[PDB]
Amino acid sequence: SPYGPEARAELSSRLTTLRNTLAPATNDPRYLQACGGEKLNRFRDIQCRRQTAVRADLNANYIQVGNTRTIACQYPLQSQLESHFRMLAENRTPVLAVLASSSEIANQRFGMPDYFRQSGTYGSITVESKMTQQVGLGDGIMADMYTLTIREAGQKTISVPVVHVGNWPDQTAVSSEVTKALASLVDQTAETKRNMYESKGSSAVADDSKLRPVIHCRAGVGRTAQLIGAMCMNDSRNSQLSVEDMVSQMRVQRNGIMVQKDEQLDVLIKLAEGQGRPLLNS
């Protein structure tokens, strides 16, 4: 069976090898290094691929899985908020998906600022938060939506749709059903916003680095990878893209930890099996 224990073992084997090869070394040329001074990485074991880095002062990466273009990042540190907001505005972000739990955000020891559920000022940038709709994803998992309006003197004001799942604890994986529903909501939200920019003739439509959904949890490697994998399988242009391809691409373009837990990988495998999508490359 293409989805049996033999195939699953082989997939794990290949992915394990890749994670080790991608392990970060001292002053690794493959990973973004702190530009001296403030901290760059929220975790010293979760690095940012240099060649695909979005900004020199952020732990965030451009990722393309098959034809699906996104941005994956860590939860921004307090000192990185101004840069985070500027990145969101310049990207003409069609949707920001936050998968960090309200419990993590509320834990002061974790240093995860609640930057999207309240308004505030960050350097020269002012942000307004407004609540919008709420969509149930199943199993009690809720998606709370907001709109973040980013203002800065001399810059165009940009509003960003936010999808926040506050009940998805770290080191865990929600069901394939919930994940599929989440991916559909995130893609739909982005499509509506992207279309608006196209109707206004935005120049971002011609920039491969812009109009990308932005997704993050705490480290930007577990929950974030599970959602990105589900999103690429929701892309009608990715026929024949294998699970091996998906995970190898996320790892090579961010870090070797993408898709951390085995249960998270199982969700991607289950979603693939439902589509008759291959797990391995021949």
Partner: peptide
């Protein structure tokens, strides 16, 4: 410090 470490996430793992």
């Amino acid at each position: 410090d470490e996430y793992l």
